[PDB]
Amino acid sequence: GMTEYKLVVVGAGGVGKSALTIQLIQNHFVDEYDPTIEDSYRKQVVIDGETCLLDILDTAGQEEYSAMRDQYMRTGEGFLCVFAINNTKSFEDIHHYREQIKRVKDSEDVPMVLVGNKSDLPSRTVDTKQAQDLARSYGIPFIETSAKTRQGVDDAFYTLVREIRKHK
Numbered sequence: 504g505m506t507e508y509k510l511v512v513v514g515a516g517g518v519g520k521s522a523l524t525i526q527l528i529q530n531h532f533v534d535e536y537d538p539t540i541e542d543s544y545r546k547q548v549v550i551d552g553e554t555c556l557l558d559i560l561d562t563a564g565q566e567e568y569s570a571m572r573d574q575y576m577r578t579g580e581g582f583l584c585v586f587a588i589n590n591t592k593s594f595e596d597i598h599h600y601r602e603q604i605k606r607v608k609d610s611e612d613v614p615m616v617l618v619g620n621k622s623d624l625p626s627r628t629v630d631t632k633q634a635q636d637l638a639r640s641y642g643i644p645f646i647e648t649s650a651k652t653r654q655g656v657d658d659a660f661y662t663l664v665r666e667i668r669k670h671k
């Protein structure tokens with residue numbers, strides 16, 4: 504049977520979670536997507552020759568620590584933690600997202616990739632070295648992406664699938 508992988512995209516508002524998800528789903532850059540829409544989207548993709556079914560949860564909206572929201576995020580098997588390379592605050596937020604994922608998954612070994620998005624822009628404020636070093640601190644991959652140009656998009660999502668497989 505076709506394996507389904509439940510992937511969850513997290514990070515500060517405005518970093519490009521929806522744009523990255525849409526690039527994977529539609530193969531199109533969408534510069535405008537209602538910031539409040541949290542939804543999940545499926546697509547069949549061939550990864551290392553194996554057709555699998557990706558179920559992407561593009562998170563959005565208000566920070567809330569109800570049991571219900573915890574259970575919704577706990578359905579994720581792997582997480583993309585996204586910041587934007589021209590937004591220092593979004594990078595400084597990453598550790599909070601990482602903390603909450605560890606808590607809801609009750610594991611210090613959750614499949615996860617650090618994603619530095621908007622790599623097409625010249626306004627960089629987060630050094631690549633600092634991001635690489637944070638991924639090194641957490642023992643996870645770091646992928647540079649652009650939802651605008653498609654840079655790194657498959658690398659980010661497909662790496663997460665490979666991490667889930669290894670974890671299994």
Ligand SMILES: C[C@H](Oc1ccnc(-c2noc([C@@]3(C)CCCc4sc(N)c(C#N)c43)n2)n1)[C@@H]1CCC[N@H+]1C
Nearest residue numbers: 513562565566567568572573576596599600603604607
């Ligand atoms: C960085 C923060 O801001 C926001 C803003 C929006 N969301 C968050 C946020 N943190 O974790 C999560 C997720 C979705 C991540 C996956 C696991 C779980 S489990 C659960 N219940 C979640 C929730 N809500 C989450 N989202 N944080 C700063 C710093 C603290 C105050 N705050 C202003």
Ligand SMILES: Nc1nc2c(ncn2[C@@H]2O[C@H](COP(=O)(O)OP(=O)(O)O)[C@@H](O)[C@H]2O)c(=O)[nH]1
Nearest residue numbers: 516517518519520521522534535621649650651
């Ligand atoms: N240049 C550029 N803009 C991007 C990129 N990804 C998203 N954006 C823009 O960043 C803003 C927020 O994107 P959105 O997908 O709504 O982010 P979300 O709140 O994390 O879902 C919008 O103005 C998008 O056009 C990217 O890789 N490059």
Ligand SMILES: [Mg+2]
Nearest residue numbers: 520521538563
């Ligand atoms: Mg969005």
